[model samples]
Target: REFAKEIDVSFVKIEEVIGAGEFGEVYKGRLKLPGKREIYVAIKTLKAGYSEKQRRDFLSEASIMGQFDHRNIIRLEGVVTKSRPVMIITEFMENCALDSFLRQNDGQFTVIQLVGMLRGIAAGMKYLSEMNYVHRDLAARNILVNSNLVCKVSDFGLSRYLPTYTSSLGGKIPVRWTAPEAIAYRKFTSASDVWSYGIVMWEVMSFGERPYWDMSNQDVINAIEQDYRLPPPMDCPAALHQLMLDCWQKDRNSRPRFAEIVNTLDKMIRNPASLKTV
Candidate 1:
């Protein structure tokens, strides 16, 4: 629980801390390896004061990240758990999180850009779902991006193995992103993850706005449980809206699979260049 002995490890200075959250402080750094040139990376240090349970959870997250390898998911390069305050070194993302990115770049994603973003997310989710893993928490805040706007999903502390009959330890999931079944039964499954993915689509169309803007946490919970669906995005194509609704289906069993989602989004978005050439 206690980081009794702090180990001073060497990390090339790139930039001071730029962000932090429940996990810990994130610092940009560079590390060089033999034959390979220097690589830019982010070093996450676990807070000094952590309980035994928290440490176990932290390591579990590291283990999950270690096993996952996908283009749309953030890559975990290495971990330094030998030290008192453990440090995780991973890829350095160049752009802001999804929320900030959407806010800063409203109207930035051409229809094609929007499709690309969703495709990236679905691609990542496809991998997670294939492994029977459920990202219980999927939201704009958890998505990371790079200079080219490549999106990568992060923050696995709330993730769980899928096809299980259990709810997240915390009975209360994130209100804005929880599926109705997840909120009502407290049981999350692969289908529930898709429900969350649908909500993320709405977030993208709305430029990263939170679901139920005027509603409190409880209000969102109630609304979702009662079949309150997201209002259609302004000028959204009907097919896209239908796809989002399918994701939020009341019956988890009826929700579209990750492969379906990938195809659906693809149908809704087309590359501008391709359109122009035609």
Candidate 2:
């Protein structure tokens, strides 16, 4: 609880709602410090009609985020807990989430640009796995991009708000992005996150194509059970597609760890020839 220090509302000024997220709406805002330092920031607020439980729940996410210190992961500046509308403030990202950003500007990036983005995500996941923080949900939409094209993994804590399909215990499972083991037994682990990352890779390569086009959630499950996999996106590097296959291994234990993933990406970046075999 002490992890989140209360931020005075006067110091924070929200400009406009840029997007909606797990909490509610995210706003592009500014933070003014007492030292006369002003900085752009993203404000995630809990909308009206919330119970104490929900407000406390949202603040706890701040505590979880407060401990994480990685360049690729989003930074939590502070939280507005005592205020009427509770808020979680983070570094503002100009480019917004990766999925929509790609949709608006498709085919605008070079191969190395795509690879570098994916590598940053891998590096961020590597740090999370090392800290034993199992991000039950990971997707390209959760990855926010900035003006510098720096990709930062955001939305750490889970919420049953959106992007979910209901079936069995159906609280808030991402059908297209979840691993087989997780979908079947409702168990989430680092390996499952790697599986989600594989889908993100496809999303990035395809410039935000929906995984399993026109297929129902149950259809997607059946297809995976039958060993069906997504094909390489147009111009997707052969090497990266192969890595996706490794991540989609039927057996969760066979998937490469996040550390290994980061190392693999580093290798590819060092030797551009690896992707040239496209």
Candidate 3:
């Protein structure tokens, strides 16, 4: 596989394990750049003797992130493919995944703060959409937050550089976050991502509570088929809840685009009066 550049293992000093990733372990590492300026980076390392598919999956994210240069999207530092353990390097987010971070800091953030985070995510999605990409997974778990409360869209393992993606990769789909069409036909579009974003909104409002709770995946599918959408989170703003409903409209063509989602959130943030009810 051709790459832009291959990083040397000697330049990256692994410090501690940060979190477990899809293919292997993710580590927090210190990268010694020229000029004596040391920088922190998140390193996702593939276990040795990984299968061809696993290796491709591991390197695919680096390929995706390399093309992105958005502030609200995770930036790729480089890839270390010349060494024994191949690693994908990225900017380290201190707060980690948005879901866990929000759960830990539950109720600590004001409505505006939450909206701001969503705005960042929507902006990132908008960028991806404009670039002819579809983030097959766009839930809160895939989003990373920083100490400053800034959120960035991360985790490109399931993402694709296509206007629309139809996958044949059989796996347990995230039933709660997935769109009806996506689950039924494996078709994924920007609209499907919007549905996931709506679930993410619910997760944010509920402070990381799992959508559909303990309901079985089959139950979730049945519920959606029956037009039974999740109710708004407790104390959620009326307008925001309406937006969630809009995203889950069943007709994928009717869902708002990420650009529109960003604009709507911006309006709500600027005019708090509209968020007063429901």
Candidate 4:
């Protein structure tokens, strides 16, 4: 299939390149509406590759992005599929990458700000989980914080669209943020995602530290396979510690749901007077 040249983009004007991924690059642009001011957007283009799997993967990611409509997820506007090169157009974000943004800002966040970001991500993940999807790669890098410090999950490239399962699907899960069962059998579930969220929480607490400490990916995989859990973060709130541990449980069925996470963070944000100890 052709990319941009194959679609209806007479309305979109190219501006500048904003970001680049392993298989594609994104540009900042504006959409020209007949009676309205131009709307800002980001256009992502995938390069031609030798295998059809590449194209299929690109389209798959686009499909997932297209289906998402949550405020905490980047909105997909449209896509260019018929042109020589494919382009995915989505809502523009002025925010910086999650890891760099947090680090550049000194890795210190107000309780309110942290809670807001946590809530935003939890909201997005909950939507995906409810739809029977699992974001296998739920790291800080895939998150983007807007000007208001609200976070949105941006890259669906690593996500897996799963169907309702009565039995476990086994092998090839990502190592660092994976649950023990996932590491053992390459299976992913809504519960596994909750386990990954705990790793994300650690990243938030430790100022965006790497997920596996100094361990290599293989080592992390091995550790998880052996039922190892990350060490408790120093000075973290007791409640957060307990939540993270619960999420890291070796049994996938034991992980907390995203809805529970959202409720906890929401309460923490809304009543700081009671969360002073955190």
Give me the candidate number with maximum lDDT: 3
For residues 89-150, what per-residue lDDT tens digits would candidate 3 score against the true structure? 88889999999999999899988899899899999999998999989888899999888988
Report the candidate with higher lDDT, 2 versus 3: 3
User: Compared to the true structure, candidate 4 yields what TM-score?
Assistant: 0.87
Candidate 2, residues 1-278, lDDT tens digits: the string is: 55445679998998989988665898989998788789999998887998778777777778778878899999988788766678889999999989999999899998888889999999998887777777777998889999878999988766222222233565577899999988988777788889999999999999989899799999999999999999999988899999999999999899999988889988998998899876
The TM-scores of all predictions, comma-separated, are 0.89, 0.93, 0.96, 0.87
Question: What is candidate 4's lDDT per residue for 141-177, written digit by digit as tens?
Answer: 7888777787888878767768422234433345787
Please give the lDDT score at residue 276 for candidate 2: 88
Q: lDDT by residue for model 1 over 1-278, one digit each (tens)?
A: 22322224553344679689566788888866446687998877778888878778877777878878899999887676774557777789988698788988888677567768888999999999898888889998899988987889898888787565476455547877887777777888889889889988888878888788888988887777677898877756566777888998888889999998887667555433332321
The 0-to-1 C-alpha lDDT of every candidate, in the order given, reads: 0.78, 0.85, 0.89, 0.75
Q: What is the lDDT of residue 223 in candidate 3?
A: 95
Displacement of the residue 203 alpha carbon in candidate 4, Å: 1.1
Q: Count residue pairs with overlapping backbones in model 1.
A: 0
Give the runs in model 2 whose Cα sits over 4 Å from its true position: 159-168
What is the clash count of model 4? 11
Residue ranges of candidate 4 with Cα displaced over 4 Å: 1-7, 48-51, 163-173, 225-228, 232-235
Candidate 3 local lDDT, residue 59: 86
Query: RMSD in Å for candidate 3, one decimal?
Result: 1.3
Q: How close is candidate 1 to the true structure, as a TM-score?
A: 0.89
Which residue pairs show backbone clashes in model 3?
none
